[PDB]
Homo-oligomer: A and B are copies of this chain.
Amino acid sequence: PAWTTFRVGLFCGIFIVLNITLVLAAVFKLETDRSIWPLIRIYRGGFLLIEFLFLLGINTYGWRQAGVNHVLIFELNPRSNLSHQHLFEIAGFLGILWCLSLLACFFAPISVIPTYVYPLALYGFMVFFLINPTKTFYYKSRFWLLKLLFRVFTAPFHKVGFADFWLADQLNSLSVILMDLEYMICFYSLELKWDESKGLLPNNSEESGICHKYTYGVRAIVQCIPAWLRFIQCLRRYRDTKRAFPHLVNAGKYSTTFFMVTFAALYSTHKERGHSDTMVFFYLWIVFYIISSCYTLIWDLKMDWGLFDKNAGENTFLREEIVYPQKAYYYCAIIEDVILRFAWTIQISITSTTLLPHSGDIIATVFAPLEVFRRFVWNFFRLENEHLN
C-alpha cells in the first residue's frame, strides 16, 4: 500500500543521512589512539543482517516481477504474503537502530549511560522486536519466522520443507552474525569492568582479545553451527526422501566447510603455539581447500541453478538454461559468483582461525558484505530453478 511504501522511503532516507553522518563522524571525529576494531567487530553483525534484509527486499521484488511465484513453494498464505516493501522497511528500520546505536558509540551522551550499553540496546531491541508476543509489529509473518527458526535450530525430528532449507542456507552466509555475537560475549567478558568512560573502543593495548578459554575451540563451533545444522538438515532429508544425487552431493558441500575450518584452526593453533614446522605440513590443506571451494562452486552453478546443461539446454544461451524467467538484461552472473564464492571462502578462513591478525578486521569486513551480495545473487538464480523444477 501507500503507507508501507512511504515508510520504505522514510526509513531509507533516515538510513542514508545517518550513514553520511556515520562516515563524517568516522573521518572528522576520528579516534586518537583507541582501537576502532572492537566497534567494527560488534556492529558488523548488525550491518550484515540489515544488508541481507535489504537485499532480500530486492530478492522478493525480483521474484515478484519474473513469474517465480515464491508463495507456492515457501508454503505461505497467498492471500496474505509479505511484499518486497515490507522487507525493505523492516530492513530500513533495523538500519535506523543500527545507525543510531553506532552514532551513540561515536557521540557519547552523558555519564549516567556509558558507551557499552548501546550495542546491547541494539541487539536487545532487535531480539525484542523478533519475539514480540502479541503486538501488531508483524504478528503473522514473524511468528512464522520464529517457528521456522525453532524447526531449523532443531534439525532432527522435523521434516524439512523448502523454507527450512532456504533459511538454513541463509545462515550459511550469515555465520558472521553468530561470530560477532560470540565475540560480543568474549569482549564483554574481557571488559565488563566499566570505568564509566569507554566500554567500547579500548586503548591501544588490546588486553588479549585473541586469548580466551579453548583458543580456536568453541569459536570454530560457533563458526560451524550453521554449516552443521544444514548438514544434519540435509541428512534428515536423506532419511526422508532416500534419494542419493541431490542429497549426498549437497551434504558434501557443507562437510567440506566442516573439515576445512577445523583443519585451518589446527593450522592456526599449530603455527603460533607449539612446533612451527607447518610450512608444507598443511600445504595440502590449501589444495584441499581449493577443491572444497570449487566443489561448492560447481554445486552452486550446476544443480541448484541448473545454469548450463548441454542435456536439453537451449543452444544460443550457453550462459543460461533452456527457459529463463529473468528478462534479457541483468544476466545470470557466473562472474559475480565465481569471484565472491572465493571471497567468501577466503573470508571464512580468515575471520575464524585468525591467520592474518593485522588484516583480520579489514579483509573480513570487506568480504562479508560481498558474500551477502553473493547470497543475494544466489536467491535470484535458485528460485528461478525451484519454480521451474
Contacts and interface: CB of A to CB of B under 8 A. Distances in A.
A16 interface: yes
Interface residues of A, number: 16
A244 interface: no
A199 interface: no
B5 A9 contact: yes
Most buried by B among A5, A6, A9, A16: A9
Nearest to A88: B6
Interface in A1-34: 2, 5-18, 21
A227 B340 CA distance: 67
The complex is assembled from copies of this chain, and their number is: 2
Contacts of A21: 17, 21
Nearest to A16: B14
Contacts of A13: 9-17
A7 B2 CA distance: 12
A1 to B, nearest CB: 9
A94 to B, nearest CB: 15
Contacts of A5: 2, 5-6, 9
Contact of A7 (B7, B9, B11): B9
A16 to B, nearest CB: 7
A15 B14 CA distance: 9
A6 B13 CA distance: 10
A18 B17 CA distance: 8
Interface of A: 2, 5-18, 21
19 contacts: A2-B5, A5-B5, A5-B6, A6-B9, A6-B12, A7-B9, A9-B10, A9-B11, A9-B12, A10-B10, A10-B13, A10-B16, A11-B13, A13-B15, A13-B17, A14-B16, A14-B17, A17-B18, A21-B21
* 5 tightest Cβ-Cβ pairs between the two chains A and B: A9-B9, A13-B13, A17-B17, A9-B10, A10-B13
Given A5-B9, A9-B9, A13-B15, 11 more contacts: A2-B2, A5-B6, A6-B8, A6-B9, A6-B12, A7-B9, A9-B12, A10-B10, A10-B13, A13-B13, A13-B14
